[PDB]
Structures are given as structure tokens and as C-alpha cells.
Design a binder for these strands. Structure first.
Ligand SMILES: [Zn+2]
Ligand SMILES: [Zn+2]
Length: 63
RNA sequence: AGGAGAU
């Protein structure tokens, strides 16, 4: 698992909330309604909001 | 860090 810093945001700076493409958004996607995945390990099991990795990769101290 | 395009 790897990536870069990001936050709960909208529009530019993020991608289609359904597939992960940039030329469109989740409401203009061209595939069926996918499960959204952890922005950190892509595990649908949980969310980055609970990623078992970030707990020791970037647990931060502010939110 | 959790949805819908500024949070
Ligand atoms: Zn898409
Ligand atoms: Zn995760």
C-alpha cells in the first residue's frame, strides 16, 4: 500500500468516487456502482477513516 | 479522512 497526503475534499484534487478516474465523477462514471474503498489500502472492508495501516504509517495528531 | 464535486 502506498499513496500521498489527501483529505475529505471535493472537485479537483480527487477523482470519481466510484471508479477512481479523473476525466469524470461518480455520477458520470461508465461502469456499475462499485464499492468505495479505503483511500489508503483500497480495502472495502474498512475506510481510511479506520485503515489498520495508517495507524502506524500516518496516525497524525490533528483532525 | 468517507462519499456526490469545497470541503
Ligand atoms: Zn468512475
Ligand atoms: Zn485501509
Amino acid at each position: 500500500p502506498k499513496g500521498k497526503s489527501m483529505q475529505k475534499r471535493r472537485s479537483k484534487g480527487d477523482r470519481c468516487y466510484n471508479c477512481g478516474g479523473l476525466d469524470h465523477h461518480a455520477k458520470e462514471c461508465k461502469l456499475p456502482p462499485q464499492p468505495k474503498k479505503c483511500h489508503f489500502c483500497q480495502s472495502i472492508s474498512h475506510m481510511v477513516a479506520s485503515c489498520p495501516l495508517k495507524a502506524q504509517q500516518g496516525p497524525s495528531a490533528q483532525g
